[PDB]
Write a structure and sequence with these properties.
The protein has 137 residues and is mainly β. Helices cover 10% and strands 55% of the residues. It has one domain: Lipocalin (Beta Barrel). The protein has 2 helices and 10 strands. Bound molecules: the ligand *C/C=C(C)/C=C/C1=C(C)CCCC1(C)C. Interacts with RXR and RARA. Interacts with importin alpha.
C-alpha cells in the first residue's frame, strides 16, 4: 500500500476518445497517443501526502496533495480545477474535480496499486473512461 515508484506505462485504452470528449484539437489528439508522448510518472508517497511528477518529451509537471484536502491542479486538457482525493479501498484512491471557471464535462481520476505491483489509472470525462496501466522501473 505504498504508491511510491518510477512508473512506466504498458497499457492504455480509450485515451484519444477521452481527449475528444474534452474538445482537444485533433492535431494534438494524434500526437498525444503517439508512443513518443508516453508519460513517465514518478510518485513519492508518505502517509496521506503525495508528490506526483509527470514527464513527456517537452513537458514536466508536478502536483502535491494530501488525501482529504482540496488542492488545485488542471484537467487532462489543461483547464484549472479544484480537486479532492479520497480513499475508496486500501489500495485505490478517487479524485473528483470542479472547474474554477466556466463549464465542461464532468471529470475525475482514480489510482490503484494492484497486489501484482501494477499501477492502474483511470481518467473519466462524462461517459468515457480511459484506463492506463503502469509497472515500476
Ligand atoms: C496518457 C497521457 C498522456 C499521453 C499525456 C500526454 C501529455 C501530457 C502528459 C502532458 C501534456 C502533453 C501531452 C502529450 C498531452
Amino acid at each position: 500500500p505504498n504508491f511510491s515508484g518510477n512508473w512506466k506505462i504498458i497499457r492504455s485504452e480509450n485515451f484519444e476518445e477521452l481527449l475528444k470528449v474534452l474538445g482537444v484539437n485533433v492535431m494534438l489528439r494524434k500526437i498525444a497517443v503517439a508512443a513518443a508522448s508516453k508519460p513517465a510518472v514518478e510518485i513519492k508517497q508518505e502517509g496521506d501526502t503525495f508528490y506526483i511528477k509527470t514527464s513527456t518529451t517537452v513537458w514536466t509537471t508536478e502536483i502535491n496533495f494530501k488525501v482529504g484536502e482540496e488542492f488545485e491542479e488542471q484537467t487532462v486538457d489543461g483547464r484549472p480545477c479544484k480537486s479532492l482525493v479520497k480513499w475508496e479501498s486500501e489500495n485505490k484512491m478517487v479524485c473528483e474535480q470542479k472547474l474554477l471557471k466556466g463549464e465542461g464535462p464532468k471529470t475525475s481520476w482514480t489510482l490503484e496499486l494492484t497486489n501484482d505491483g501494477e499501477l492502474i489509472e483511470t481518467m473519466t470525462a462524462d461517459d468515457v473512461v480511459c484506463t492506463k496501466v503502469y509497472v515500476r522501473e
